[PDB]
Nucleic acid binder design. Structure first.
Ligand SMILES: Nc1ncnc2c1ncn2[C@@H]1O[C@H](COP(=O)(O)OP(=O)(O)O)[C@@H](O)[C@H]1O
Ligand code: BEF
Ligand SMILES: [Mg+2]
Lengths: 108, 83, 96, 95, 449, 95, 88, 109, 96
DNA sequence: CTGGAGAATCCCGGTGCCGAGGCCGCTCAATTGGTCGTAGACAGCTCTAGCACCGCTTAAACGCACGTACGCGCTGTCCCCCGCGTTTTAACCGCCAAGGGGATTACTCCCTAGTCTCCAGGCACGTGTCAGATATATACATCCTGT
DNA sequence: ACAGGATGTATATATCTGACACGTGCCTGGAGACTAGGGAGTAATCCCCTTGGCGGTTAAAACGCGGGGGACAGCGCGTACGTGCGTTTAAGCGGTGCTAGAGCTGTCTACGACCAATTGAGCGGCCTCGGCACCGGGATTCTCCAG
């Protein structure tokens, strides 16, 4: 037997291709599932993950703090139009409201 | 044993801080009675389903997952509680 | 005795380091990222399942996932994502 | 000294729109949740995080309703929220 | 009984044959070649059924709208003892005529269009009719058409078809006429199939046909000329871009966007006729220039042959087209030339149509060109005055064209009629003309009885 | 004779509410569906029933939006609907 | 010129003012401002764009050139606009 | 073998137990389906069918018609507080709008 | 033609005649009724499937369909639908 | 208009701490290889229903003008919140106990899927006929005007 | 205040038409009745996490009430609303022609699921020096008011 190479290494990905395949097979999505399907889905889940954490990291540095916390994630999603369209029906715990007053209410 | 009316335990100061996070500058006096009923109707809908799930599982304890599934049905996804 | 619980946390950590090398993350922000990955997995897999039933096929494939991604994601996110996934399948099929 | 009517209301908006704490007091809400549960089944016990999941969802719902309610009062050319503004917002939402 | 003039020997023989159908108790088809007087043969039959059989009962005639004023005129001329009435007009006029003229029952022939029948079907089914004459019977060739259904619900002692193109495209479209005449004989098209070298066997009992070449030796035969033409450079450009499907064209900016092409065949056909039919194609939004119009169409370059014709005696001409917009551009060309002309089309009101025909036919008339749309103007109307016919377009049905040519070649034509057909050489217009000729072969213009 | 302003407007409201017919013309709507589509993919053909599903869904959407617009107008104490009332209805519905 | 007698409007204009007024009358609107015709056209066009884009995604996936009634019904269902009567 | 009896006849139902079982088995809901699951589901679908047709038939009768049409169905669903909650997000074709004119809008007296 | 099309139409008509013997129904209305049965079926089977998964079970049983009915229907319909389902399963089991 | 006073967060530098990253061990799901059988790509054929044009008729929309319902800017009005301080109650924190019940593993044995075979419910089909449509007519509603 | 005009509306009766309604013939999913082997249920065990005990004592809620903000009614003013006229427009209907491309069946062979076997990524457990909560020092700088 030759030495093993995990399918994520073959596709050049950090998320797990093997686990995604099990989850699909046992999740009642279809009678069968192809071998390119877990590779495509693992690549999309890692891209969307990197898209959030990039803007979260920048919100953490803007607050001058080294660790991402749950508020930083809210400030990222809400301040981007497409992530706010993707996550428009979601509540995030320990997430504040973006700062905002209607200009009618401000003093003269 | 049996709990009396705790809906008066949602205080006038606490309803006012929720109106402030929502950007509200001035509040009429009758908002508080109106808000308590609105909260009670929302909680009754979420708890009813959360308990239907617990009963199906044959458990006496309501879990954080039972609440998360109840909210997910009503179009109110919540991140953070093991979802 | 105490059973194991699976999560995405070690992959989320490895992707953060690639994006922002010096930054860390709290355990509550990890619980939220683990919730996000599972929500998006379930959305894509539910649309990919139906599209196959509509067209009377029994197999989920990369083409049904590609259509599912175009239906679910907003316009620009969809474009970049589609490129990332087709890239990954191109690299994988060169090395299977 | 005395600040003027509505000046401290603006400081309160800014302060609560920066923080992520829960605003309703915890123990009182725990008694409210349990009282509601007796209408559906007797002698339920509860995980501590199941009550926090209910509180997070409940405060998120009320804050969002107060935003829709405020738009309606500005539409009617006023700055004070009224019971009819909550009723209009819920009706137009489909609740 | 017939007053104004004498029937010719073939009209006499046709009358005796129609009488023999009546006495044998059968219906039948009269299908002499166009221009041979089928209308008078019909008017004389009705005079007989009143003067000799004592039947003044109600009779009906169905016609195309453009011939309602001719039929009426001939009734008034040859046989004035028939009491003919005509239904046409707005809702109030139809209600007034039904109430004040039809239902009184003071008439013996009723003349109507196919639309007037489809509108007043519930009134006309009250009456019990003695004869039902349909003219241009090819109109009922498809049995599923609403006119064909409506027409089979009537109470009629006798039925009659008049048509000079009894065959159209297939044997089922002729069976559909036989099934109106004798539905209890030709019970089915699956029974007509197989019955069918069976030439004239089924037909002779119920059909009669004579040809001008046999029965009117004095009428000059037709001359037919194909003129093949090249495209203009602009037409060659559009014809290639249309095929590529990169027409583009958008008047509201958008970098010209794309024009949709779900049917390319019709776009290619348009182009051959003129480039200006397309949007944004005429050069210069101001427009009004006219030399440019003649040049950018290979057909129009040749059409200046109208100047030779006008100088060459009164070779007055008819121009036929299948597209309404083409009559527009030809009309702007004639107006810019200062020519004298007439135009008939499907948009025209009824009163106007007959005035135009009359003005063009007068003995001292000065109009050189008549423009006719091929559907509305190609049937029934008689225009013996003109010597020339131009077919700018070519139709998928050969028989439609034949009729149009015959608007001029008819009894009373003193001179040889020339027919010119335009064809763009290396285009889909070749395939259309080839297909139409493939359909002529199976018809063969059978002379018949 | 001349009916007063708004007398015929109530009479039309009653007629149209009783009927169940489509109110937009079919050819003018069919030509708009086709143009919008050409942007997404080119040279498409359409089933005759597919354009009717689009027209039923479109007229149902607009009628329902005009109800929310009229409650947002009456809240501001007016009887005339205006562009701002359409915009508040679409904002409270979250679209 | 006979050739230029006719002039064409944009296809949005086909939704006429008389056509919008009836829809508002079915919705119980008594009086209508003159700026609403422009606003309503903008709103319908955004609705048709979002439904059609998806109905075409389904058609492409099936490798067909014709949009069917089912392609429209599935697109409306996926957006919360369930329609009864056209099958499914 | 013994002569066949439909499972709907055994349950005392008009809807099809056999078709429902096949639909569930081939819809990819669970890797197994129980024997009582198709009978319980067919009972619920027939009950909900009867609830709509009873109200629709009353609406047809009040309108003096012998035939139920799409308008009668809308009137039934929208005047019932539970069916209008079950069906709050569906559009019924050729279904009208319940008649309602707001009070402010009406003539003065 | 050359292809059959299943529908609920005959079942809807057999129930119609028990509820109102005198009435009939149009083809447009019967097409809406077929759509109602299909929609409700897909709702109840989606909740049942999820319930099984959450509780880690391989089978959908009547106990999961009873709970799905209780999660989906409004209160007066839910209490009657549960009564009709339990009456049918008792009667079916007596003949089985 | 605007100087001044004086309560608001706001930086700054020290102090302690249990959160987060590291590693250990070792657990149990991914890997490879081989094999089986059937989903789905291909090509071919047929023939339904897509499109275009023109013709026909007349509902419909177009623009015009008329005149008055009601859009919306100012004013006066006088009630009900706001903000302050005070006193007051019940939240939080921490500490420590009993025992409900989540959870584990183990055992046993009822349940459903599989196969093949079989014959009756349900499919489309074609046809007579009656709810529905609508034509004309009128009788009773409701609205407007002017006096 | 309320009399006749006028208008639309309702419904009475008639005849009429075309979607429904029956039954026919036909054929393919439902139903019989056994074997298969796993899921499921129920016993019992362990010890996580829940339920109130007390006291302590901060902070939060509560009360009362001076005072000026906004809510709201009314008036008058003025310009797009609606109304109906005549007019022109093209929806709607029907009809012709044609062939794009949905649909079916047929054939053949790449693919995925499965098994057994294998060994490494990933799990939980036990660890600790460094992120950053917290306290108490001074900094402007928010806002407001009587000169
Ligand atoms: N016997 C006749 N004597 C004189 N003129 C005739 C005679 N028969 C026909 N015509 C004329 O010849 C013309 C062509 O006849 P027409 O009725 O149009 O035949 P069709 O309808 O078959 O073309 C008619 O205008 C008619 O006036
Ligand atoms: F046969 Be014809 F020219 F009416
Ligand atoms: Mg003639």
């Amino acid at each position: 037997r030759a030495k093993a190479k995990t399918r994520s290494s073959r596709a050049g990905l950090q998320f797990p291709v093997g686990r995604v395949h099990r989850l699909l097979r046992k999740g009642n999505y279809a009678e069968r599932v192809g071998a390119g399907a877990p590779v495509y889905l693992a690549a999309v889940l890692e891209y969307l993950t990197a898209e959030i954490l990039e803007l979260a990291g920048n919100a953490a540095r803007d607050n001058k703090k080294t660790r991402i916390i749950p508020r930083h994630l809210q400030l990222a999603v809400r301040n981007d139009e497409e992530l706010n369209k993707l996550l428009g029906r979601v509540t995030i715990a320990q997430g504040g409201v973006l700062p905002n007053i209607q200009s009618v209410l401000l003093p003269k | 044993k049996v709990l009396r009316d705790n809906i008066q335990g949602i205080t006038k100061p606490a309803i006012r801080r929720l109106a402030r996070r929502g950007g509200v500058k001035r509040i009429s006096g009758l908002i508080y009675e109106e808000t308590r009923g609105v909260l009670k109707v929302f909680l009754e809908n979420v708890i009813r389903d959360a308990v239907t799930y617990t009963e199906h599982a044959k458990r006496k304890t309501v879990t954080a997952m039972d609440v998360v599934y109840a909210l997910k049905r009503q179009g109110r996804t919540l991140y953070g509680f093991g979802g | 005795r105490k059973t194991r619980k699976e999560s995405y946390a070690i992959y989320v950590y490895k992707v953060l380091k690639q994006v922002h090398p010096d930054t860390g993350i709290s355990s509550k922000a990890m619980s939220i990222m683990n919730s996000f990955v599972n929500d998006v997995f379930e959305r894509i897999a539910g649309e990919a399942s139906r599209l196959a039933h509509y067209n009377k096929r029994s197999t989920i494939t990369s083409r049904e996932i590609q259509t599912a991604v175009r239906l679910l994601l907003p316009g620009e996110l969809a474009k970049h994502a589609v490129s990332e996934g087709t890239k990954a399948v191109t690299k994988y099929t060169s090395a299977k | 000294h005395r600040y003027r009517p509505g000046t401290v209301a603006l400081r309160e908006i800014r302060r609560y729109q920066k923080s992520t704490e829960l605003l309703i007091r915890k123990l009182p809400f725990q008694r409210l949740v349990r009282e509601i549960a007796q209408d559906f089944k007797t002698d339920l016990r509860f995980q501590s995080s199941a009550v926090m999941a209910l509180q997070e969802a409940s405060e998120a719902y009320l804050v969002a309703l107060f935003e829709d309610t405020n738009l309606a009062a500005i539409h009617a050319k006023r700055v004070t929220i009224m019971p009819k503004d909550i009723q209009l917002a819920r009706r137009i939402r489909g609740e | 009984y017939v007053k104004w003039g004498k029937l010719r020997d073939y009209q006499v023989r046709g009358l005796n044959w129609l009488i023999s159908l009546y006495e044998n108790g059968i219906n039948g088809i009269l299908a002499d070649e166009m221009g041979l007087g089928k209308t008078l043969q019909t008017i004389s039959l009705l005079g007989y059924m009143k003067h000799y059989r004592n039947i003044p009962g109600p009779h009906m005639v169905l016609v195309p709208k453009s011939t309602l004023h001719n039929w009426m005129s001939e009734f008034k001329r040859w046989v004035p003892t028939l009491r003919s009435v005509c239904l046409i007009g707005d809702k109030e006029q139809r209600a007034a005529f039904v109430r004040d003229v039809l239902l009184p029952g003071e008439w013996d022939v009723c003349v109507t269009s196919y639309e007037m029948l489809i509108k007043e079907k519930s009134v006309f089914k009250k009456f019990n009719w003695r004869y039902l004459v349909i003219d241009e019977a090819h109109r009922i060739k498809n049995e599923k058409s609403k006119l064909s259904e409506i027409v089979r619900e009537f109470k009629t002692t006798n039925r009659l078809l008049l048509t000079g193109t009894p065959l159209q495209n297939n044997l089922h479209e002729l069976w559909s006429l036989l099934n109106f005449l004798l539905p209890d004989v030709f019970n089915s098209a699956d029974d007509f199939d197989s019955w069918f070298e069976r030439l004239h066997m089924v037909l002779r009992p119920f059909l009669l046909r004579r040809i001008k070449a046999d029965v009117e030796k004095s009428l000059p035969p037709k001359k037919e000329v194909k003129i093949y033409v090249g495209l203009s450079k602009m037409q060659r450009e559009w014809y290639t871009r249309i095929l590529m499907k990169d027409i583009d064209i958008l008047n509201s900016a958008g970098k010209m966007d794309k024009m949709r092409l779900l049917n390319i065949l019709m776009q290619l056909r348009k182009c051959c006729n003129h480039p200006y039919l397309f949007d944004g194609a005429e050069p210069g939004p101001p427009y009004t220039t006219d030399m440019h119009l003649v040049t950018n169409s290979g057909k129009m370059v040749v059409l200046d042959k109208l100047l030779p014709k006008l100088k060459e005696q009164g070779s007055r001409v008819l121009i036929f087209s299948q597209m309404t917009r083409v009559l527009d551009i030809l009309e702007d060309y004639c107006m810019w030339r200062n020519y004298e002309y007439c135009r008939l089309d499907g948009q025209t009101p009824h009163d106007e149509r007959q005035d135009s025909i009359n003005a063009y036919n007068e003995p001292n008339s000065t109009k050189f060109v008549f423009m006719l749309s091929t559907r509305a103007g190609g049937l029934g109307i008689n225009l013996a005055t003109a010597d020339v016919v131009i077919l700018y377009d070519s139709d998928w049905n050969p028989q439609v064209d034949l009729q149009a040519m015959d608007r001029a070649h008819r009894i009373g034509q003193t001179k040889t009629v020339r027919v010119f057909r335009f064809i763009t050489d290396n285009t889909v217009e070749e395939r259309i003309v080839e297909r139409a000729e493939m359909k002529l072969r199976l018809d063969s213009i059978v002379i018949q009885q």
